[PDB]
Amino acid sequence: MSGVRAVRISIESACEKQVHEVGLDGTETYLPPLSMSQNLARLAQRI
Amino acid sequence: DDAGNRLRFQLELEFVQCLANPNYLNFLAQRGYFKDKAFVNYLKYLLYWKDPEYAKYLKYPQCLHMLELLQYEHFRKELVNAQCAKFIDEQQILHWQHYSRKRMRLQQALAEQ
Amino acid sequence: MQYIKEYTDENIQEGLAPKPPPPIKDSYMMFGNQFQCDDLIIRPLESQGIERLHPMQFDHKKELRKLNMSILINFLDLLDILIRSPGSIKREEKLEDLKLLFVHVHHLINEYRPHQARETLRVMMEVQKRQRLETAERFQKHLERVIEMIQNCLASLPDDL
Amino acid sequence: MADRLTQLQDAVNSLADQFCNAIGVLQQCGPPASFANPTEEYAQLFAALIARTAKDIDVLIDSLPSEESTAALQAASLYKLEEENHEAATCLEDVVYRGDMLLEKIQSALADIAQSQLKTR
């Protein structure tokens, strides 16, 4: 409002915390692995 | 013919909104429309609400969520039991409380301090 | 419910035979029980539909307390009315007067639902700016730390002979 | 919700609720004929409860802070937010480019001696 313009500014969503499974009365558990070059090994184990 | 475009748009809008209901797809399942070749040709076609241009008229999330399960055709042979449709329904509402359960903990965190 | 067949085979075709996208609706939208048209007024004011006993000065905390103040003395006055003549005609005038008092207090307090969104949309995104920043001097502390690696390797380059 | 404005609403709601309950208990039971004990001990309990809720109303009315700040000041606060966040992209991408031309050179400075030792064999 109040005559503000429309421009293209970057807004990043709060992707610091993710949700997978909900326990009883809340209190979920937080699991990003964020692995290193060990991920290269898994794609070759299926090879 | 502007009548055909608008009327079909809102008819097809509510169809995926009706498809957002998990028990409605259960109602497809005892009706056995999951294996109909015209409907599997239709439900592969139905996947065009994923773009945000058509999604500004779309209002609820799990319409697109459970439609993609139907695309694999593995999910379509089940759901004849109402217990797995209820399990999908129960887990969806067990995670619709996410923002509520997130907000109450931060409210508890601020009230504790 | 109903099944649709008119346009399902329209869009499984070849070329531009599937229908083009509809234009942006700049008119009445018929979604649901509401209308939800464009450029609507956000809220109706207290001026229409509600009799007004407060002036335009709007002492918001004092309008909160005077309405609390006037209701309590009118409730004691109504108790005295019920003590003296509860079967009077003047009861519903008294009942709608305090109801008039209760309308004004409720509309004034709720003004921070769009106002709260402006602080919070700000405050997290200087942290990612900070995270963009604290990785920025991370980059010169990394790039000049390997130039000095190049420098000592070049300094040891002839000395290794 | 769940701010101190909400607990003021239910406190004055329960105060009006405990008024009619105290009135309701005082009219449903009492001394039948004496020309009692459970009614009065309810009455002292009800008179105490309406007093503490009236006490907490004054406590919480004074406890609530006054209305603060304006949306227009925060509207101007977003105006400086956008210009610094645009240039932060430019300030980040420039040292990225310093990394880009440096890595392109040294990966070639990796490469030119990388295949050089192949033909050494």
DSSP chain A: -TT------------SS------TTS----------TTHHHHHHH--
Q: Specify the residue for token string 């129960």.
A: B90
Instruction: Tell me the C-alpha distance between A32 and C56, whole Å.
Output: 56
Collapsing DSSP states into helix, strand and coil, what is residue C20? coil
- Residues in chain C within 8 Å Cβ distance of D85: 125, 129
Q: Is D92 exposed, middle or buried (0-12, 13-18, 19+ CB in 10 A)?
A: middle
| Best CA proximity match to B82, nearest among B20, B17, B38, B28 | B28
Chain centre distance of CA D62: 20
C17 and C10 Cβ atoms separated by less than 8 Å: yes
Structure tokens at D87: 């240039």
Q: How far is CA C71 from CA C65, C76, C105, in A?
A: 10, 9, 11
Residue of D nearest to A9 (CA): D82
Resolution (angstroms) equals 8.2
Structure tokens at C40: 């609507």
Name the C residues in 14-33 with CB < 8 Å from any B CB. Answer: 19, 21-22, 30-31
- Residues in chain C within 8 Å Cβ distance of B12: 4, 7
Q: How far is A2 from chain C (nearest CA, A)?
A: 13
Q: How far is CA D40 from CA B40, B76, D20, in A?
A: 75, 69, 16
Burial annotation C27-53 (CB, 10 A radius, 16+ → b, else e) = eeeeeeeeeeeeeeeeeeeeeeeeeee
Residue of C nearest to D103 (CA): C143
- Whole-angstrom distance between the N-terminal and C-terminal Cα of chain D? 75
| Best CA proximity match to D19, nearest among D40, D42, D49, D41 | D49
Q: How far is A38 from chain B (nearest CA, A)?
A: 31
- Name the structure determination technique: cryo-EM
Residue of B nearest to C11 (CA): B45
| Best CA proximity match to D81, nearest among C138, C123, A42, B82 | C123
B92 and B22 Cβ atoms separated by less than 8 Å: yes
- Spatial CB neighbours of D85, under 8 Å, sequence gap ≥ 6: A9, A10, C125, C129
Collapsing DSSP states into helix, strand and coil, what is residue C30? coil
Collapsing DSSP states into helix, strand and coil, what is residue D13? helix
B63 and B17 Cβ atoms separated by less than 8 Å: yes
Instruction: Tell me the C-alpha distance between B84 and B75, whole Å.
Output: 11
D63 and D55 Cβ atoms separated by less than 8 Å: no
Q: Specify the residue for token string 């000395």.
A: C159
Looking at the partner chain, which of B12, B41, B48 has a beta carbon nearest the beta carbon of C4?
A: B12
Q: Is B22 exposed, middle or buried (0-12, 13-18, 19+ CB in 10 A)?
A: buried
Q: How far is B109 from chain D (nearest CA, A)?
A: 12
For testing the chain A interface, which of B92, B96, B100, B101 should be mutated: the one with the most A CBs within 10 Å? Answer: B101
B62 and B12 Cβ atoms separated by less than 8 Å: no
Q: Quick one: DSSP state of residue D66?
A: P
Instruction: Tell me the C-alpha distance between C1 and C5, whole Å.
Output: 14
- Spatial CB neighbours of A28, under 8 Å, sequence gap ≥ 6: A19, A20, A21, A22, B101
- Residues in chain C within 8 Å Cβ distance of B48: 11
Residue of A nearest to D79 (CA): A4
C36 and C66 Cβ atoms separated by less than 8 Å: no
Instruction: Tell me the C-alpha distance between C99 and B59, whole Å.
Output: 37
The full DSSP string for C68-105 is HHHHHHHHHHHHHHHHH-TT-STHHHHHHHHHHHHHHH
Q: How far is B96 from chain A (nearest CA, A)?
A: 10
- Let me know how long chain A is: 47
Instruction: Tell me the C-alpha distance between A18 and B62, whole Å.
Output: 18
